[PDB]
Nucleic acid binder design. Structure first.
Lengths: 30, 225, 97
RNA sequence: AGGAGUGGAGCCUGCGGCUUAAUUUGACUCAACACGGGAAACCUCACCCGGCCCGGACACGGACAGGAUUGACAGAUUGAUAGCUCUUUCUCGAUUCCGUGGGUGGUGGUGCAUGGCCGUUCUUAGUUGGUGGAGCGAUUUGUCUGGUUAAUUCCGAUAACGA
RNA sequence: CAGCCACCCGAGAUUGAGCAAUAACAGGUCUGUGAUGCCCUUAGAUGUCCGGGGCUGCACGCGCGCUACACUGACUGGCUCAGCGUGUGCCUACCCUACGCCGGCAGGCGCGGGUAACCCGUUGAACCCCAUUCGUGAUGGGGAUCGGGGAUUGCAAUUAUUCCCCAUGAACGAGGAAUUCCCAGUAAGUGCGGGUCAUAAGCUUGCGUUGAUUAAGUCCCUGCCCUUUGUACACACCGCCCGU
């Protein structure tokens, strides 16, 4: 599961908030 | 025993198409690029282009003998009449079929599609290609399917040059979720000789032979020792 | 299905003698392009082949109206356990190597 | 202020309105309606007056030299040289069968899960990076006042330059 | 400047099509495809077997189709005409066709040629013409059914296949509301060939043949695009929204 790909695909869906959190984990210590 | 020339040409085309589909569905994992049937007096020699050749021949030429035998017993040739070889392809990076298979087998294990698509695109560009674009359409989780496309370089779409400057490959990737179809298009570079790209240039490209630097005195004077 | 045991042993010596084959799915039609004139009815031979390759223990692949087969050693083991024919009688397919 | 040929005057089809075996799937404006290259007796008819030869790699049940297979005109069948007649105890002969589904699958659903193909928005001239300007920013310039072209075609102009 | 108009010259002076930009649509296709992800009926499997009702009705509920108005329409058969193309075994049992039985020719049977620029065929029941004709238009001029001559041979055809003649007289000469297509070899007339197929076409895809009135314009209707402007619209005017 690519965190960046998940963000680019469904940031605007029901899972946008959790997908944003997973993206921030991959990039930095977010 | 005999059929007209139209029927004969059509039958030859059908034979080529079915042979290509057969050794596409058999050894897509073996880097198979395409088939080329060569006429030879009372003979039909077949050449297979593949990125991996140790795996199409295998140990002791097992796979070759098996699939040659089945092609023999299938396509109505007389006993021991079909002999196919397997030679490497000089242009592996900018063959659409090979890169489509490479993507399908990077994705079949289960992997992020962006990394694989960018790797394939980077490898085609570093293979000297003039331009590429990869489209992967299908399911990415959810109630809807998306299509994401990766382009780099320059590419043409219309006119006749697209027939001999762009090679296209459409392949299906079967995941447990469903099917995603990939589409690899490569714009071959212009190269005289070598069969790496088309011989003719783009019809809208006009060339001029370039002069060289000329810094000369006013009048030529002979010099002797 | 609906297959007699004499035709079963007939198709079984056919599988023993050939090993690597090509075929086409034909059932109703009474003459066959490449697997006819075998002194055995076409329908029962083809249905026995269907049993062989679709019972649930040897895989297949159906495309372009033709059949190409990889006969696994699990099927060979099943045959040896049932009919008690040892593999010491090697198939003659190991020539022209 | 043009017209010509129109669907109404000379070779039946598509699908809904629309008695029971008749108005039978997919397609609800352009972007459905001789369209699925679909010219329906029948193999492709599901609206159909009617049937038979029937399926299970397994989860559990009924138990072996008999637990039935398209397969007879004249007493008939519901059109039918179909044994289906509440009929012979002719006939491959262990083939199979019933209750629930994955299965060797179903022209079985879902095209609001998809791929691939098409069709269309949209036959028009449209569209987008990089670097550089502007704006806090969404974004904008480039991609334009004009003239010109079928054309974002070119001339030219010019915080845009190269593509 | 880009270019525009006209004119010589010229075979030809915006000349048929094909291909065709990301974002698009919950557009169609799961009934083209062991291309493809499973909630899930039934034994009356959406298997077979020249087998078998319809739909080939007529108060039309609609849509695509089958059709020319006069000396121009068609006959004297009195001169060499067109194609575009198709045509016979993996499957497979199904191809295109050149004389006589003879009523008056496709043709029920013998017969050869052609896997084809070789045969059909310089395309075998066709121009649009014409000493069968209209003297001013219901006559000879273009057919309301519907009957016989031998039927290509497809069990069935009627519950879709299969010829011209007796001249038996049909608003017999520019068409509710609404409208579809079209600018030169357009339209329209006309036949022919491919696909489907058993030479099965009223369908479609192509091809020639006769041959063209009107227009070289506009943004009025329907829309589209390159701007400026307004917006309380963004599911985007089929929007949003006010009132007992």
């Amino acid at each position: 599961t690519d965190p960046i790909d998940d963000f680019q695909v469904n940031w605007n869906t029901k899972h946008g908030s959790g997908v944003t959190r997973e993206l921030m984990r991959e990039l930095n210590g977010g | 025993v005999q059929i007209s020339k139209k029927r004969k040409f059509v039958a030859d085309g059908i034979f080529k198409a079915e042979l290509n589909e057969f050794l596409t569905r058999e050894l897509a994992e073996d880097g198979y690029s395409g088939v080329e049937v060569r006429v030879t007096p009372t003979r039909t020699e077949i050449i297979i282009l593949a990125t991996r050749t140790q795996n199409v021949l295998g140990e002791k030429g097992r796979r070759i003998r098996e699939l040659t035998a089945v092609v023999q017993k299938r396509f109505g040739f007389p006993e021991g009449s079909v002999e196919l070889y397997a030679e490497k392809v000089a242009t592996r990076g900018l063959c659409a079929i090979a890169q489509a298979e490479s993507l399908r087998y990077k994705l079949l294990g289960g992997l992020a599609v962006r990394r694989a698509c960018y790797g394939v695109l980077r490898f085609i560009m570093e293979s000297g290609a003039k331009g590429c674009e990869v489209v992967v359409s299908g399911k990415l989780r959810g109630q809807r399917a998306k299509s994401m496309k990766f382009v780099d370089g320059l590419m043409i779409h219309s006119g006749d040059p697209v027939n001999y400057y762009v090679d296209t490959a459409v392949r299906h990737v079967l995941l447990r979720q469903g099917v995603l179809g990939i589409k690899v298009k490569i714009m071959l570079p212009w190269d005289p000789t070598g069969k790496i790209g088309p011989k003719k240039p783009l019809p809208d490209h006009v060339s001029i032979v370039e002069p060289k630097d000329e810094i000369l005195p006013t009048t030529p004077i002979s010099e002797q020792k | 299905m609906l297959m007699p045991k004499k035709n079963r042993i007939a198709i079984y010596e056919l599988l023993f003698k050939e090993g690597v084959m090509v075929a086409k799915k034909d059932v109703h039609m009474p003459k066959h392009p490449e697997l006819a004139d075998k002194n055995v009815p076409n329908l029962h031979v083809m249905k026995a082949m269907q049993s062989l390759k679709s019972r649930g223990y040897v895989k297949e692949q159906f495309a372009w109206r033709h059949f190409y087969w990889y006969l696994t050693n699990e099927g060979i083991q099943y045959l040896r356990d049932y009919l008690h024919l040892p593999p010491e009688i090697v198939p003659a397919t190991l020539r022209r190597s």
